[PDB]
Amino acid sequence: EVARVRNLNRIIMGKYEIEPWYFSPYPIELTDEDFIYIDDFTLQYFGSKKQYERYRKKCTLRHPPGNEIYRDDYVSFFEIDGRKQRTWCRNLCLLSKLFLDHKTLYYDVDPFLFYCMTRRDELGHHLVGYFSKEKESADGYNVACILTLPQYQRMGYGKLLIEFSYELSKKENKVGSPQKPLSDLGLLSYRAYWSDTLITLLVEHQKEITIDEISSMTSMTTTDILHTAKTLNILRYYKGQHIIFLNEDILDRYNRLKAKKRRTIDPNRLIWKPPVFT
Amino acid sequence: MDPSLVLEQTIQDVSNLPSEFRYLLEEIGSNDLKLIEEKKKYEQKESQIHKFIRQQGSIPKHPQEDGLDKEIKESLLKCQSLQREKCVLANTALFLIARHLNKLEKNIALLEEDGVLA
Amino acid sequence: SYEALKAELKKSLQDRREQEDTFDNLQQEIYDKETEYFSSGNIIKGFDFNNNDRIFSLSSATYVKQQH
Amino acid sequence: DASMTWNEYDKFYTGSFQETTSYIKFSATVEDCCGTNYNMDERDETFLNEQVNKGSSDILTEDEFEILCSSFEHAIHERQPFLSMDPESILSFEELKPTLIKSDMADFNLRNQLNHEINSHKTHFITQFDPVSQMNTRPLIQLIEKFGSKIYDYWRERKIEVNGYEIFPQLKFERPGEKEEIDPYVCFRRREVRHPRKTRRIDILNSQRLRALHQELKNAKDLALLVAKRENVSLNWINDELKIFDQRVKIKNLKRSLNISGEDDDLINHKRKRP
Ligand SMILES: CC(=O)SCCNC(=O)CCNC(=O)[C@H](O)C(C)(C)COP(=O)(O)OP(=O)(O)OC[C@H]1O[C@@H](n2cnc3c(N)ncnc32)[C@H](O)[C@@H]1OP(=O)(O)O
């Protein structure tokens, strides 16, 4: 009942004021405040402007508390273990819950890995979005929860998050799919990514390619590939096996896609090996 | 008290330490290289002042003494700034390892208080 | 006033002399300790030799000049 | 929603983060990079300005104020973990004072030991995790004598107002005693692993690996200390060069004023055998 309504009024994270969408189990005392301050580096919450000032004067953290595993001239990625960075990841989950309806903070942050995308500045790395990942997922999900902060939305950051999630799966020699209850906005973004990567792969390959060969090059599960082909009306059934072809539409879609000149993830700048858990 | 647990926890705690040591030490080297190039910048200007004193003494003023003294003081000042950074960096590496070492020594002491560890 | 400045400068030139001597010792001691301790688990390798693995000595650009 | 901009942002976010050529290697926690865990609110600063520093010859700084309160918070949690059972029975300053003296906040004893080992014995052991503003603050033991009792009286009342809980708003954690209330504000429950023990032989083998790992940390700590010493004496050297430079200019000016000749040997550097 209480969780089904917006918990907080307005939040000032860094220089950007954001308006929360859903309930988040912040300290209930903060619900009586007009403004809540969120540190741009530690994601710590504040109801008192004086406590915020004192905190900023003593805080030396200027990036996510973890190793930088990716960096280009646009964004960087940090890998953070929930078990190692309890305080920071709790703050991230509390912040993310404001914009994820079904995010659960029932248990602690230990069983999750947090891949956080930041943009660098004179002041440091500013978090723009992230996606979590189970350390050991039974269903093989490569993404648990994914979020682009509202102040950085509609800038293509959501696409970069999804790209990086598959670049991790490709480096893991595994196929992956986002956790199955996808939000309305989240589903819309994955369908757009799946179409764009499938259309680009088919056109550049220029030869018939098997479903298993597409799944091997993109780390997409066969389920997502088949579903993406059905939407594009390029899937057919012959002799008990699925076949993907090319038509005028795909070649036309590839042209409009390439003209967009979107930022992309450079796999050569990803210095990362999969963590080993005993 | 479980020695296998203590060993597992210690390795997990110290897993990222060798990466941090290399990262900190190569930043110290990067700054020490900047320090050497800045040392030559003032030692050459200081050699000009000293060359003058050897021939004529400290009583005659070097034709560019007032200009060189300001430039040497400036270069000597930014050398102090670079050197402070290396001290800070060196302190972090020492702090990280000492803090990991103290936690391990506490565990070893707790294991010795029982018959678990000899 | 002239005598005071000259006498406290000989002491500071002496301290600079002392700091340079202990600096040279530390440089050598660092190099020797690298040899003793690193020649299973290592701060160099990962806790789980080579002259280029002397990450402590390579932190000094004076040591880099010597080796090159 | 997030179009809006904050105007006081440039006041709260100052400084510069310098990018490094190689990727960042970091694992310190938020607690490591925040400093003193206590932060004054608007009520604390009016008390410090109007009741403590109004006519005082000795000024208590905001930073020093937080040092005292953080020690009070740490001591009470140790001695009275169940303070909420009877908030008005909170210990007095004199009763808590012995615990305050022995308190080791933010690895003070470790930092003090490292400061001693480096041969610095000057300033404080400062890392990448420490802010420059903390330089001015006095030691805790000195603060306990001058301002300990007066500040504790104020902090005692705030602790009573919150019924023995925390002054800063806290997350609601689950309690073992209470049945679940289906409370959406309860979060971050923990569930232990509960793994079976290894065989005794593996315990002995791992006990040997623990001793070997202990030796390697000692070896790395020795190298880390030597590098800290090398940079410490290099800091002493450049501080001498600055002082020597100003002592050479002043002598030359006075020497020219009196027109004295010779004695130039201290005014020029002399080459000597250097490895
Ligand atoms: C695992 C699951 O539960 S999914 C949960 C997903 N996360 C959320 O819903 C939290 C709130 N939303 C967000 O954080 C972000 O919007 C994300 C993560 C969904 C995507 O981030 P964005 O940066 O906004 O997406 P991005 O700008 O990269 O664009 C990707 C696509 O989403 C579409 N899109 C993004 N926002 C909108 C919108 N408000 N309305 C319509 N379409 C949108 C874009 O049109 C784009 O498709 P296109 O190529 O055809 O133009």
Residue D188, sorted as left (phi over 0), alpha (psi -120 to 50) or beta, turns out to be left
For residues D132 and D258, membership in a common domain is answered with no
Based on the domain organization, do D143 and D220 belong to the same domain?
Answer: no
Find, in chain C, the residue whose alpha carbon is nearest to that of B26: C59
Whether residue D157 is found in the same domain as residue D221 = no
* Domain presence at residue D196: no
CA distance B28 to chain C (A): 6
Q: D155 and D33 in one domain? A: yes
Range of the domain at D42: 24-161
Cβ proximity of A106 and A247 under 8 Å:
no
Which among A25, A50, A56 is the nearest to D41, CB-wise? A50
Query: Nearest-CA distance from D25 to chain C in Å?
Result: 14
Site to substitute for ligand 1 among A127, A145, A153, most atoms within 8 A of C-beta: A153
Q: Is the CB of A190 under 6 A from ligand 1?
A: no
Q: Confirm if A105 and A93 have CB atoms less than 8 A apart.
A: yes
Distance separating alpha carbons of residues D209 and D133, to the nearest angstrom: 43
| Co-location of D223 and D94 in the same domain | no
Residue type, D133: S
Helices (H), A98-183: 157-171
Interface residues of B toward C, Cβ cutoff 8 Å, are: 11, 14-15, 17-18, 21-22, 25-26, 28-29, 32-33, 35-36, 97
C30 touching B (Cβ < 8 Å): no
Taking CA atoms, A20 is separated from A96, A117, A151, A179, A266, in Å, by 10, 20, 11, 23, 33
Residues D33 and D140 reside in one and the same domain: yes
Residue A140 near residue A173, CB atoms below 8 Å: no
**Dihedral angle over CA of A41, A44, A49, A55, nearest 10:** -60
How far apart are the C-alpha atoms of D266 and B42, rounded to whole Å?
Answer: 18
Query: How many domains are there within chain D?
Result: 2
Measured between alpha carbons, how far is residue A250 from residues A23, A259, D11 in Å? 42, 14, 52
Residues D78 and D152 in one domain: yes
Contacts of D270 (CB under 8 A, 6+ apart): none
Strand order across the A125-134 sheet:
A67-71, A76-81, A112-120, A125-134, A146-148
Inter-chain touch A63–D17, beta carbons under 8 Å: yes
* Residue A113 DSSP label: E
Return d(Cα D242, Cα B75) in angstroms, integer: 10
Distance (Å) from the alpha carbon of B7 to chain C's nearest alpha carbon: 11
Strand partners, A35: A10
State how far the Cα of D115 lies from the Cα of D219, in Å rounded to an integer: 19
Chain A, residues 21-40, CB within 8 A of chain D, namely 23, 25-30, 40
CA angle B24, B27, B28 (to 5 degrees): 90
Chain centroid to Cα D25, Å, comes to: 21
First vs last Cα of chain B: how many Å apart?
13
